[PDB]
Design an enzyme around this catalytic site. Sequence first.
Site, short mmCIF file in Angstrom:
data_model
loop_
_atom_site.label_atom_id
_atom_site.label_comp_id
_atom_site.label_asym_id
_atom_site.label_seq_id
_atom_site.Cartn_x
_atom_site.Cartn_y
_atom_site.Cartn_z
N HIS A 293 32.90 6.69 -28.88
CA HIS A 293 32.23 5.48 -28.33
C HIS A 293 32.11 4.08 -29.41
O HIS A 293 31.78 3.27 -28.89
CB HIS A 293 30.71 5.63 -27.88
CG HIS A 293 29.87 6.12 -28.77
ND1 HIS A 293 29.54 7.35 -28.91
CD2 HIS A 293 29.16 5.40 -29.32
CE1 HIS A 293 28.48 7.41 -29.96
NE2 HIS A 293 28.21 6.13 -30.08
N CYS B 127 25.00 7.74 -35.17
CA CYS B 127 26.30 8.37 -34.43
C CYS B 127 27.17 8.54 -35.29
O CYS B 127 27.46 7.89 -36.35
CB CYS B 127 26.80 7.34 -33.22
SG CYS B 127 25.59 6.78 -32.22
N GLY C 31 22.82 3.43 -34.75
CA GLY C 31 23.67 3.84 -35.71
C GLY C 31 23.78 4.91 -36.62
O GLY C 31 24.62 5.05 -37.31
#
Lengths: 304, 304
Positions: free
Chosen positions: A41, A145, A143
Amino acid sequence: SGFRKMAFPSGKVEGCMVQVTCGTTTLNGLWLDDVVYCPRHVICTSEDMLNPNYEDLLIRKSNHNFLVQAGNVQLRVIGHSMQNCVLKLKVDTANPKTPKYKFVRIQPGQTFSVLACYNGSPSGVYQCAMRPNFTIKGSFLNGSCGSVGFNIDYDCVSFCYMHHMELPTGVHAGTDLEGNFYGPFVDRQTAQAAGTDTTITVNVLAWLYAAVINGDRWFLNRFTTTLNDFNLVAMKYNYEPLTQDHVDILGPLSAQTGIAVLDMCASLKELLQNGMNGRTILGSALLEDEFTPFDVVRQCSGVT
Amino acid sequence: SGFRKMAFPSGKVEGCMVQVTCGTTTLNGLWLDDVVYCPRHVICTSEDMLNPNYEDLLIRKSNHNFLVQAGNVQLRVIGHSMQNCVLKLKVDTANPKTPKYKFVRIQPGQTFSVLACYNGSPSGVYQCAMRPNFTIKGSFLNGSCGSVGFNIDYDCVSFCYMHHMELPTGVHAGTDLEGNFYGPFVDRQTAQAAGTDTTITVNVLAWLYAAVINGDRWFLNRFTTTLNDFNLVAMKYNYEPLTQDHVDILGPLSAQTGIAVLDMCASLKELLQNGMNGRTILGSALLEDEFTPFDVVRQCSGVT
Ligand SMILES: Cc1ccnc(N)c1NC(=O)Cc1cccc(Cl)c1
Ligand SMILES: Cc1ccnc(N)c1NC(=O)Cc1cccc(Cl)c1
């Protein structure tokens, strides 16, 4: 003496964290050898997340659109591919700090350490468990991720998790390092509910053994039970059913304390039925299920 | 989302851990620049610990009696001195992995991360708090001596603790990096009792603010209180008295949530008076006091 929710030393993973930017999206990547692993993503805008077609979105991305920064220096991206829900960015330089590693897909109930990161930098480390509903109860913000979950056996880091998503209930979902999600979750901005978060019975038993080893013994009773009688109680209290496999891995703890696994099950049965009565076990007022039998042995013996 | 007992990333400290042997005693040392810091009881045998005269014992020790091993290689000891309860071993090589560092003496109630070590190797990391009775509730076994406690501000490691002793009650005692013990403890094999382990009120309040930020709000009530009324309740429940200094550092949390510090004190007052009634706050069935206001802000904002 003492028992703590202890995480593995995070240094070997810290040397692997990089920052990956694609367009205006920045997240964390894991640099091992000449490959940077990150959630797919990273290629999405906030609008794309509603219903992303990752294969279609990836067509508009070239190697130069993936900015990889390790500390303060820029890695040159010479290849990219999508493997399930992760992107693998081939860079022109092997990570000099790459430890010995493996990618493992863990089972629910297993524990691991998480190195929470933001913009490629580590903020902290904590111990987690893959819940029976395949979510994790982490501590992650926007953030985070790309932050990874791992275990360490002497010098080998076994990466088991990469953080991808926060469910609308504040619990976390993610993948193994092959990009396959744990549980039924998809990397999309769509409400996805979690199943029953049952308690990891074998882990609660392992923690009761750790309490006995450390001196908290008030909960030991004069009773015993059978696996079938125990499981009737476990079902009623949303505890995972206990099997002979679970009994087998509690054997070293049973041997160290002289308390038969089924006797400890009867102590757990009474604790479920009567509660703690305002008392604590290892500084906790509830039954802790994020220590596996292996974690208890390791912590109680001093494995480095 | 989520709130965890999070430790600082341990990598910067891992690169400092060495093993120090003197005679038949082995413990952990901290190698910073060209100096190795370790507990002075490394010079003692089990018999010496009953009533050691460290100045007398150190006369029989030369630089070559201190064996310092960093990983698998041997450091040459070119000097030694005793500073309070620590030995400083001057080695001929600066630690190439020495991070930016400071030695700080913390106040009770302050938190820190511990990198538990054995034979110079790290086993795990966990978050601790210096109790108001100057003990720590760690997880340490024989050989863990020399393991250090620290905080990290961006790139600077502030070392605040070095583990020395286990009290007969299973709680831990140690020094700052200047060798001064926290509390009244002495490095001797003599029964030494700890004082009242009171609860760190400002930390419980900070944790209640973290719970509100994360969605656990059931404990918020329609009441307020004064510092003097609150402290009568705090005294009764062995909570540390709350001061305007404590109120001042809870200000950013009060501002983020819109909940005045004295209103949160009234919520804490009712929780002390009524208990949790079988409920949980941030997955805990008791009031957590090992998160400072600073820890809550850092975790809730993503400081790396
Ligand atoms: C905001 C936040 C907090 C903690 N952990 C996170 N991972 C996030 N970020 C997201 O969940 C963004 C996202 C939206 C839809 C699908 C995916 Cl794969 C990811
Ligand atoms: C056995 C153990 C477990 C955990 N943490 C420890 N530090 C120890 N070791 C000791 O306490 C040995 C000792 C005896 C008397 C004085 C001093 Cl300074 C040290």
